[PDB]
Ligand binder design. Structure first.
Ligand SMILES: Nc1ncnc2c1ncn2[C@@H]1O[C@H](C[C@@H](N)CC[C@H](N)C(=O)O)[C@@H](O)[C@H]1O
Length: 368
């Protein structure tokens, strides 16, 4: 059986390792492709069905979708795949030749075997790249064809806001995807603990991607520019055995982070300090790790950020024992701050954070 698993662009390999460790525990055989068909923010999972013997002595299925929904920290959506196809030249086909290609394609799909003729259903679409039709055209064309198809078999029941079964149709570049979205209208990154909403907060999946890349070992972990608290809370909710510390310049944000941590059940295990990271060595003497989503300093200045990174990183030099994991839009400010201060890049990545192409670096001190 086949699942399309989504996550942030540029973290597919991290999401893969995450997915394996999890399914291995079930005993399942499976195989996982990064970026099926070249599309980013995706994994195509192939597994055998997960059977056990139940209380009645009967073969019973274990939901793999449920298992992943419940336990993954990196995934956005778990979708049961019905088909994945390239439509050559679609975004360059004219509006009506496009809807045409779609409907005829979907009309062929045995969609009745994925939904009970008599469950409710909606379509939700995601469209992307340059096309001649809208995202709304897809939900429309795809919806027509599911409804028409299901009719042959009975009485189709449509419900936009409270479906029991969401079909999701994605068209990205020239790749079309149709599937059953098991995750729902709220994507997995939408955390219940997030009661204070930071204007520049880290998407929780990318937070765990930073945690993984750090290769933590029980040593103390610091978010010097913590904000809303995302990175530290994710790490506490992973049950991390080490000290966890967050420093945040602005009180409002820091009290937000404490409220977020209260709502997540982990406020006890994080030490939250109002404080200024360019004076870092006043707040601490030693930390094994530092993990931060740095302020991107949008707009200009005329030179705000270069100077912020330069000081912070000089302070960091003073206290860091193992590794730093950092995220920023400001490629230049960061790499000079890194260079001038005797840090060494041991990993660099590009990631899609919401809609911006962010840089992620892993660093150590040179002389270590
Ligand atoms: N000199 C400084 N020292 C410490 N923190 C700072 C300093 N300058 C800015 N900050 C904070 O850095 C934080 C960076 C945020 N982008 C972090 C978002 C956070 N990762 C979250 O998910 O909620 C901002 O909330 C700023 O208040």
């Amino acid at each position: 059986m086949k699942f399309l698993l989504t996550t942030a662009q540029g973290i597919e390999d991290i999401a893969k390792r995450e997915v394996s460790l999890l399914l291995k525990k079930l005993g399942i055989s499976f195989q996982i492709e990064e970026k099926p068909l070249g599309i980013e923010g995706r994994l195509l999972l192939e597994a055998e069905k997960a059977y056990y013997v139940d209380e009645k002595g009967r073969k019973r299925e274990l939901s793999i979708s449920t298992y992943l929904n419940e336990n993954s920290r990196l995934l956005h959506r778990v979708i049961i795949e019905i088909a994945s196809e390239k439509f050559n030249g679609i975004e360059k086909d004219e509006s009506e030749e496009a809807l045409k290609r779609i409907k005829d394609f979907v009309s062929s799909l045995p969609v009745e075997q994925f939904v009970k003729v008599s469950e409710t259903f909606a379509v939700r679409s995601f469209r992307k790249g340059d096309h001649n039709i809208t995202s709304i055209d897809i939900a429309r064309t795809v919806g027509e064809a599911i409804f028409e198809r299901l009719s042959r078999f009975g009485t189709p029941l449509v419900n936009l806001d409270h479906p029991a079964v969401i079909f999701r149709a994605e068209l990205i570049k020239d790749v079309f995807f149709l599937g059953i979205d098991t995750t729902g209208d709220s994507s997995l990154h939408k955390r219940p603990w997030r009661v204070y909403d930071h204007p520049a907060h880290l998407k929780a999946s990318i937070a765990n991607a930073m945690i993984e890349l750090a290769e933590l070992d029980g040593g103390s972990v610091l978010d010097p520019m913590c904000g809303s608290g995302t990175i530290l809370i994710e790490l506490a909710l992973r049950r991390y055995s080490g000290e966890i510390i967050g420093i945040e310049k602005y009180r409002k944000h820091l009290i937000g982070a404490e409220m977020n941590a209260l709502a997540a059940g982990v406020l006890d295990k994080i030490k939250f300090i109002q404080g200024d990271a360019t004076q870092l060595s006043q707040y601490v003497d030693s930390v094994d790790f530092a993990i931060s989503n740095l302020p991107y300093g949008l707009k200009i200045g005329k030179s705000m950020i270069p100077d912020l990174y330069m000081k912070f990183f000089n302070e960091l030099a003073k206290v860091l024992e193992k590794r730093g994991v950092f995220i920023t839009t400001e490629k230049k400010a960061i790499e000079e701050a890194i260079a001038e201060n005797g840090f060494e890049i041991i990993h660099h990545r590009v990631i899609g954070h919401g809609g911006l192409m962010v840089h992620l670096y892993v660093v150590k001190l040179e002389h270590h």
